[PDB]
């Protein structure tokens, strides 16, 4: 019937990711009688970071400690001896040199596993952020992602393009089952009776380039921010960007095929905001 | 980091003896537990009627039960110890003793 099933599996975000994208708080965890909500998305969120409003401290700054002021710290794990975070890729592969099930993981999966290896037994597996520029893994002591209404929000700012936000459940085979690259000269579509038809209803936002389109799709993607709030991956996670009309055509149903159109680039809320293939 | 006084409810009867443990989940090697009486004096393991008992990540208050013995606060603090809990809360717990 549909030849695109295997190729398009990775874009069934509700199945392969299964949690919020903009705000990922898809699992519950009990710790000494206290209930917590933790990110649980199985895919990496490329280009996502956290903006702390009305401060000048990056969210990757370690959390405030000792006498430091609260607003001089960030979301990251605090210093330890030996230093557990931030830890480089090479430092990680060496630190786990004797673990055969970890030492050769993908850098992102390795960062995820490392962040969930701070308590030996303990159900609190931190999320993490991986920086491809410094090849650095930052364990996030703070799993919160939005507090608009000490105020912060998630975002795909241009300066975050090399950051990847990782939940504790990121899969080792993400490169095969999760979206990353954007699709040049291709347009998401729905397969029907042997033909790839256009998405029958989209929401058009203006966007000057692919990056702004992806950032829009991210802003509108599945979100778990306040089961009643668990999105489970449902949302406006897909976008077809027309480069000639500069239109980000956003939609919220899983695509099932591709249309060849030299004017379009296919993107998702999880995809990298710039890279294309 | 998370701090909880295991007998969250402080409800004692005169002449009784009470044990209030302060447990810390996610204890970091740079953190330290400290109990404080309602007056505000830092209790120490010197074994007066009311004292404490250490463990790597937990300190057990030991309150006896005078009608004037009553809110005790446990605090986790340290130079590299986080100033916030996992829930962006203050790293302290409180138990109100009612005789
Ligand atoms: Na094909």
From Swiss-Prot, chain A:
It is found in: Membrane. It comes from Plasmodium falciparum (isolate FC27 / Papua New Guinea). The chain holds residues 107 to 438 of 622 of the full protein. GO terms for biological process: adhesion of symbiont to host cell. The keyword Glycoprotein applies. Belongs to the apicomplexan parasites AMA1 family. Keywords: Disulfide bond, Glycoprotein, Malaria, Membrane, Signal, Transmembrane, Transmembrane helix. This is Apical membrane antigen 1. GO terms for cellular component: membrane. The lineage of its organism: Eukaryota, Sar, Alveolata, Apicomplexa, Aconoidasida.
């Amino acid at each position: 019937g549909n030849p695109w099933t295997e190729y398009m599996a990775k874009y069934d975000i509700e199945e392969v990711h299964g949690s919020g994208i903009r705000v990922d708080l898809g699992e519950d965890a009990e710790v000494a009688g206290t209930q917590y909500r933790l990110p649980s998305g199985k895919c990496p969120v490329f280009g996502k970071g956290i903006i702390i409003e009305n401060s000048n401290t990056t969210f990757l700054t370690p959390v405030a400690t000792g006498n430091q002021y609260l607003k001089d710290g960030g979301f990251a794990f605090p210093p330890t001896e030996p230093l557990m975070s931030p830890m480089t890729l090479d430092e990680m592969r060496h630190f786990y040199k004797d673990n055969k099930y970890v030492k050769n993981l993908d850098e992102l999966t390795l960062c995820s596993r490392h962040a969930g290896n701070m308590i030996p037994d303990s159900n609190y597996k931190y999320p993490a952020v991986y920086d491809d520029k410094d090849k650095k893994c930052h364990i996030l002591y703070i799993a919160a992602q939005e507090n608009n209404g000490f105020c912060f929000r998630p975002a795909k700012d241009i300066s975050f393009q090399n950051y990847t936000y990782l939940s504790k459940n990121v899969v080792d085979n993400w490169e095969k089952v999760c979206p990353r690259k954007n699709l040049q000269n291709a347009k998401f579509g729905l397969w029907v009776d042997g033909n790839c038809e256009d998405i029958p209803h989209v929401n058009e936002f203006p966007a000057i380039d692919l990056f702004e389109c992806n950032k829009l799709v991210f802003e509108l993607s599945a979100s778990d921010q306040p089961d009643r709030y668990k999105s489970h991956g449902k949302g406006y996670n897909w976008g077809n960007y027309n480069t000639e009309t500069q239109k980000c055509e956003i939609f919220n149903v899983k695509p099932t095929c591709l249309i060849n159109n030299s004017s379009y680039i296919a993107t998702t809320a999880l995809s990298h905001p710039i890279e294309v293939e | 980091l998370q701090v909880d006084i295991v007998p969250s409810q402080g409800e004692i009867s005169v002449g009784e003896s009470k044990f209030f443990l302060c447990q810390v989940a996610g204890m970091l090697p740079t953190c330290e537990i400290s109990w404080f009486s309602p007056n505000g004096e830092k209790l120490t393991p010197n074994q007066q009627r009311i004292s404490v008992v250490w463990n790597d990540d937990s300190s057990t208050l030991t309150i006896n039960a005078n009608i004037d013995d009553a809110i005790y606060k446990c605090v986790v603090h340290g130079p590299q110890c986080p100033r916030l809990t996992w829930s962006l809360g203050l790293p302290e717990a409180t138990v109100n003793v009612k005789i």
